[PDB]
A paper describes a structure:
To gain mechanistic insights into the Eaf3–Rco1 interaction and the preference of Rco1 for H3K4me0, we solved the complex structure of Eaf3MRG–Rco1PHD1–SID–H3K4me01–12 at 1.60 Å resolution. In the ternary complex, Eaf3MRG adopts a canonical fold similar to that of MRG15MRG, and buries an area of approximately 2072 Å2 with Rco1PHD1–SID. Rco1PHD1–SID interacts with Eaf3MRG via three interfaces, with two for SID (interfaces I and II) and one for PHD1 (interface III). The Rco1SID C-terminal region contacts α1, α3, and α5 of Eaf3MRG, with the loop between α3 and α4 interacting with Eaf3MRG via hydrophobic and hydrogen bonding interactions. α3 of Rco1SID further makes hydrophobic interactions with α3, α5, and α6 of Eaf3MRG. Unexpectedly, Rco1PHD1 also interacts with α3, η1, α4, and α8 of Eaf3MRG via electrostatic and hydrophobic interactions, albeit fewer than those found between Rco1SID and Eaf3MRG. The interactions between Eaf3MRG and Rco1PHD1 raise the possibility that Eaf3MRG allosterically reinforces the Rco1–H3 interaction by stabilizing Rco1PHD1. Consistently, ITC binding assays demonstrated that the Eaf3–Rco1 complex binds to the H3K4me0 peptide with 5-fold higher affinity than Rco1PHD1 alone (KD values: 22 μM vs 110 μM), underscoring the Eaf3MRG–Rco1PHD1 interaction mediated by Arg300 and Arg303 of Eaf3MRG. Similar to previously reported PHD complex structures, the H3K4me0 peptide lies in the negative surface of Rco1PHD1 by forming a two-stranded antiparallel β-sheet with Rco1PHD1 β1. Collectively, the first five residues of the H3K4me0 peptide are specifically recognized by Rco1PHD1.
Author numbering:
A (entry chain B): 258 to 375
B (entry chain C): 1 to 6
C (entry chain A): 218 to 400
The structure:
Amino acid sequence: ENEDFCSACNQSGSFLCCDTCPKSFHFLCLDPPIDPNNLPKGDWHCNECKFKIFINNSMATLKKIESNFIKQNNNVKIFAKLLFNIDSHNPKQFQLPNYIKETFPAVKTGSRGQYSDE
Amino acid sequence: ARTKQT
Amino acid sequence: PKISLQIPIKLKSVLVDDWEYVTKDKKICRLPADVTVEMVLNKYEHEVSQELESPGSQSQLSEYCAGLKLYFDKCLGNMLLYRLERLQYDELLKKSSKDQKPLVPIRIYGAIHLLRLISVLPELISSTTMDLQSCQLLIKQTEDFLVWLLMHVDEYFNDKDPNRSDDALYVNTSSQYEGVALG
Ligand SMILES: [Zn+2]
Ligand SMILES: [Zn+2]
């Protein structure tokens, strides 16, 4: 069974459900956003599942796949591992890290992540 | 594809 | 080991203002931005490369800026937007499709979204197997960029309030936009 909340923003509402894992997502929280007036007719998989489906049906290993990418991206070598990781992770809502938020003690985070100053 | 409301 | 990134307090305050504008005031950024990520990083690289003597320093600076641009293009729609901004993003993508050209985020989004990406670099770096030397170099290059960006806070982060100017960095959303975007 699929989950009750959007994996990207943790809120309630209408979701597309992954067919190979329990995650659910708001149509607009996906990357790219899915149009509810043009929903996919067949199965649908989240980015994380899509990546594992990719890897498994690959002749090479995830270590080798990663290795060739880094070679392919030597012009931006310091970012190559960061770039490779993107496609294995589902989209999420941006949130400021705690080391920024904690600098401002008068500011609180509300129940949906919203800025609150009482 | 499957949808869900909650 | 925790990855620590030193962000000047004035730039933290810009990020907190951003958080307030989007999630409390229901504003989004005016897009495409008058000053894009590509423009910010071109100006940064051009200016600081002049004060550089070592060929290795110049190479490292250029690699950092090129990689940051590519990483921003890959991160933007995956992790750099508040929920409210996803409707705007969907519209931009649909427009790009009509135009038969891919959306290039560094030519659309601006300094505030770059600063968002920088703020989450520590967690993103810690989720890789980058060795410690490259982690150190990436953090150092980022902190050097932030020193320069702090000196340009007026250029990039002034005139933010759409309730004071029709030209501001942010725009108000309608209640119809908000309803569509947030359910
Ligand atoms: Zn969501
Ligand atoms: Zn899945």
